[PDB]
Amino acid sequence: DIFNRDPRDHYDLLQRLGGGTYGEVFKARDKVSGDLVALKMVKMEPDDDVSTLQKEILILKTCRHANIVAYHGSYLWLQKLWICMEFCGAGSLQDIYQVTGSLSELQISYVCREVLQGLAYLHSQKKIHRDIKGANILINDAGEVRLADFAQIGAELARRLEFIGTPYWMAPEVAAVALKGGYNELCDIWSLGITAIELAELQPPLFDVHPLRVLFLMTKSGYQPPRLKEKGKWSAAFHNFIKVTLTKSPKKRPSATKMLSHQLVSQPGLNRGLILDLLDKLKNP
Amino acid sequence: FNRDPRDHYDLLQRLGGGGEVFKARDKVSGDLVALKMVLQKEILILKTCRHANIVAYHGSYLWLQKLWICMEFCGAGSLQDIYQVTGSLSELQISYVCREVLQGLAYLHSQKKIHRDIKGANILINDAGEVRLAGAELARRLEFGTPYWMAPEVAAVALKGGYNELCDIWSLGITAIELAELQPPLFDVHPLRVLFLMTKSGYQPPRLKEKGKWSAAFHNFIKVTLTKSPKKRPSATKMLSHQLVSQPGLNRGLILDLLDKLKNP
Ligand SMILES: CN1CCC(c2ccc(Nc3ncc4ccc(-c5cnn(C)c5)cc4n3)cc2)CC1
Ligand SMILES: CN1CCC(c2ccc(Nc3ncc4ccc(-c5cnn(C)c5)cc4n3)cc2)CC1
C-alpha cells in the first residue's frame, strides 16, 4: 500500500547516509515517537510504469527474511518514491573496517554465513542481488548482518538504457543479453568470495590495477581467479572457501545453499558476539 | 605513423562526432579523404579487412594524444542523411543497398568480425553511387563502475554484449524497413518497452506497413532476415542467393538517380 503522503510530515531527516545515481538514503526520525528508520529516496521518471512499481513493492513487502533489511512501507510524493526500512546503526562493513582494520577469520566466517543465508533466500525468490561488497553489507548495533533488497526504475534505469543505446535495430537475442547483462544468481557467490578477501585485506584483489586492464584479464582464456595474499595467516578452510566461491565457470560455481554446507560457514561458534567484539573495537581502537 | 596529419592533408569541413570526423584533401594530388580524430592489434585487423563494400583504410597518425584514422571519403554521407531529403527509397534502390551491404557483411563474417550497428546512419554512399560499411567512447563505457567485485561472466558481457554475427542480418532487415518507411519499426515507442516486447514469447517480428506497395520477394526478404531464432536466421552468404538481391538490373545507377533527386527534389 504505497502511501500517497509526503514522508517529511512524519519524519525528520537527520543525516544523509549515502547515495548515487539512484537517489539518496537518509537516517530519519519519527516526529512523534522518535524511532529511527532508513529512508531511501528514489527519483521517478514520467515514463515509469506504476504497475511495475506496485508489483515490485508488493513482493518486497512479502520478501521477509532475517538477513534482509526490513521493509516498513513506502511513500509516493511529487515524482519521488521513499522506501522506509529498518535502520542498521553501525552502517556497512566498509564503514567499519575503515576504522577497525581487517576482520578476523571467525568474524568473516559469520558474515559470510549470514550473507549466504540472505542470498539463498533471494535466489529462491528468483532474485539477484548484483552488488555484494562490504559497502552493501549492513550491521546493526546487535551485531546482526543484513543485505538491502533492491535499479529497474528512475535514474538507474535511464542510465542503463543510455549504455545499451537505441534498441530499434537490435536482434531479439541482442536485446535479451542487453536486459540480463551477464548477471545470473551465481554472480553473487563470486562477489561474496571477493568481499571475503576485501574484509580480510581492506581492499578487493587488483584494487590498484586499472579497471580496463582488470576487465580485459577477466575475459581472457586462462584468467587466474584471485586468492588471499598471506597464506599462513588463514586456515585451509578459508583458502578453500575463496577457491570454490571464485570458480571461473558459472556452471561449476556452487549455489548459496551448497555454500552453506562448506566447512568455513558450518563451524560452531559463529554468532553475533563476534561482531559485537568488532563494534567495541570501533568505539575504542 | 607518428606525424601530424596537418603535413599531409588540408582540413575542409567537420562531418560529425560525439571524437570527430572531418573531410580533408591530399595537399599534392587532390584526393579527398575522411579523417577520424579519436591499439596495435585493432589497427592491424582494421588494415586487414579489405573489400569493395568496406570503407578503405589509408593508414593512421598518432600525434599529440590524438589518433587520426585516414579513410576513403564518401561524398554523399549516410543513407539516413540522404532519405531525410529525398524521402523513401524505391524497392530496386533498397535491393541494391541490401545486396552491397550483404557483400560487406559476408566479408566481415568470413574474418570472424561483427559489424554490430547496421542501420541507415551507418551505410555510406559515395558520389559514384557505391555502398560502403565502415578514447572517450571507451572511457564512457567504463564509467557506466568498479569491476573489482564482478564475476568474469559479468565482465565478459560488459565488454562484448550479446552480439553474434547473425545479429547484423536482423539489423539489415530492420534497415530495409527503415529505408522504405523513413523510420525503423516501433520508432515512436519507448526503448525499454521495445526491449521488453522483444524478449517476450508471442513477439511478432516487424513487417512492412503497406503490403501492396512491395513485391512478394521484398516481404519474404524481411520475413527471413527477421527470423527470431538466431539458429534459424540465414547467414549473409545464404541471403546473397535470395531473389530480392539476386535480381538483374541492380547497379550503382539506381543510387545515382537517388543522388540526382537529393540535388534537386
Ligand atoms: C561516517 N558515517 C556515515 C554514515 C554511515 C552509515 C551508513 C548507513 C547506516 N545505516 C543504514 N541502515 C539501513 C539501511 C537500509 C538500506 C540502505 C540502502 C539501500 N540501498 N542502498 C544503496 C543503501 C542503507 C542503510 N543504511 C548507518 C550509518 C556510517 C559512517
Ligand atoms: C548535411 N550533411 C552534413 C555532412 C554529412 C556527411 C557525413 C559524412 C560524409 N562522408 C564520410 N565519408 C567516409 C567516412 C568514413 C568513416 C566515417 C566514420 C567512421 N566512424 N564514424 C563515427 C564515422 C564517416 C565517413 N563519412 C559526407 C557527408 C552529409 C549531410
* CATH number for the domain that contains residue B84: 1.10.510.10
Q: Which of A99, A118, A115, A119 is nearest to A107 (CA)?
A: A115
- Does residue A80 share a domain with residue A120? no
Surface of B (171-200) touching A: CB under 8 A: 171, 174-175, 178, 184-187, 190-192, 194-196, 198-199
Distance of alpha carbon B73 from alpha carbon B56, whole angstroms: 9
Question: Which residue type is seen at B111?
Answer: Q
The C-alpha cell of B18 is what? Answer: 560525439
Distance of alpha carbon B154 from alpha carbon B138, whole angstroms: 17
In the annotation, is B117 catalytic?
yes
- Does residue A172 share a domain with residue A58? no
Is residue B253 within 8 A of residue B239, CB to CB? The reply is no
Domain boundary among B39, B72, B105: B72
Distance of alpha carbon B114 from alpha carbon B167, whole angstroms: 8
Atom of ligand 1 lying closest to residue A19 CA:
22
- Does residue B253 share a domain with residue B125? yes
State the Cα torsion B10-B14-B19-B21 to the nearest 10°.
Answer: -70
Helix axes B91-110, B253-263, angle to 10 degrees: 120
- Does residue A111 share a domain with residue A82? no
The DSSP string of A92-107 is EHHHHHHHH-SPPHHH
Alpha-carbon separation of residue B223 from A253, B137, B197, B208, B234 (angstroms): 41, 34, 18, 10, 11
- Does residue A189 share a domain with residue A273? yes
**Residue A46 to chain B, least CA–CA distance (Å):** 12
Distance of alpha carbon B168 from alpha carbon B115, whole angstroms: 7
Residue of B nearest to A187 (CA): B151
The C-alpha cell of B167 is what? Answer: 545479429
Distance of alpha carbon B31 from alpha carbon A229, whole angstroms: 60
Alpha-carbon separation of residue A50 from A23, A53, A126, A155, A209 (angstroms): 18, 5, 22, 15, 42
Catalogue the E-assigned strands of chain A. Answer: 11-19, 23-30, 36-43, 71-76, 80-86, 91-92, 137-139, 145-147
Our measurement of the distance from residue A132's CA atom to the centroid of its chain's CA atoms, rounded to an integer in Å, reads 4
Q: Which of A48, A50, A69, A49 is nearest to A60 (CA)?
A: A69
At residue A129, the 3 state secondary structure works out as: coil
Is residue A157 within 8 A of residue B192, CB to CB? The reply is yes
B153, B192, B198: residue with CB nearest A250: B153
B148, B157, B175: residue with CB nearest A194: B148
Distance of alpha carbon B143 from alpha carbon B138, whole angstroms: 9
Contact B161 A178 (CB under 8 A): yes
Distance of alpha carbon B242 from alpha carbon B221, whole angstroms: 7
Q: Which of A281, A269, A278 is nearest to A110 (CA)?
A: A269
Question: Which residue type is seen at A67?
Answer: N
Give a yes or no: residue A1 inside a domain. Answer: no
Q: Which of B89, B86, B101 is nearest to B208 (CA)?
A: B89
- Does residue B191 share a domain with residue B255? yes
Distance of alpha carbon A198 from alpha carbon A133, whole angstroms: 8
**Residue B144 to chain A, least CA–CA distance (Å):** 7
Pocket test of ligand 2: the residue of B74, B86, B122 to mutate, having most ligand atoms within 8 Å of its CB, is: B74
- Does residue A35 share a domain with residue A15? yes
Is residue A13 within 8 A of residue A6, CB to CB? The reply is no
Distance of alpha carbon B111 from alpha carbon A267, whole angstroms: 55
Could you give the maximum distance between any two Cα atoms of chain B, in Å? 60
Q: Which of B186, B192, B224 to mutate to probe the A interface, most A CBs <10 Å? A: B192
Distance of alpha carbon B42 from alpha carbon B265, whole angstroms: 42
The C-alpha cell of A7 is what? Answer: 514522508
Distance of alpha carbon A263 from alpha carbon B38, whole angstroms: 53
Residues 6+ apart with CB under 8 A from B151: A182, A186, A187, A189, A190, A191, A250
**Residue B95 to chain A, least CA–CA distance (Å):** 18
- Does residue B137 share a domain with residue B245? yes
Pairing of strands B9-17, B20-26: antiparallel
Residue pointed to by grid coordinates 564503514:
A95
Is residue A181 within 8 A of residue B157, CB to CB? The reply is yes
The C-alpha cell of A60 is what? Answer: 518486497
B177 in ligand 2 pocket by Cβ < 6 Å?
A: no
Residues 6+ apart with CB under 8 A from B17: none
Is residue B22 within 8 A of residue B35, CB to CB? The reply is yes
- In this structure, which ligand is nearest to the CA of B15? 2
Breaks in chain A listed by the residue before each, with C–N > 2.5 Å: 150
H or E element that contains B139: helix B136-143
- Does residue A217 share a domain with residue A197? yes
Contact B153 A223 (CB under 8 A): no
Distance of alpha carbon B154 from alpha carbon A130, whole angstroms: 10
- Does residue A239 share a domain with residue A163? yes
- Does residue A241 share a domain with residue A192? yes
Residues 6+ apart with CB under 8 A from B260: none
The C-alpha cell of B47 is what? Answer: 588494415
The number of distinct structural domains making up chain B is: 2
B21 in ligand 2 pocket by Cβ < 6 Å?
A: yes
B132 in ligand 2 pocket by Cβ < 6 Å?
A: no
Pairing of strands A145-147, A91-92: unpaired
Distance of alpha carbon A259 from alpha carbon A190, whole angstroms: 11
Residues paired with B26 in a beta bridge: B9
Query: Resolution reached, in Å?
Result: 1.9
Domain with A108 in it: 91-283
Is residue A282 within 8 A of residue A141, CB to CB? The reply is no
- Percentage helix, strand, coil, to 5, in chain B? 45, 15, 40
Our measurement of the distance from residue A13's CA atom to the centroid of its chain's CA atoms, rounded to an integer in Å, reads 23
**A23-30, strands of its sheet edge to edge:** A11-19, A23-30, A36-43, A80-86, A71-76
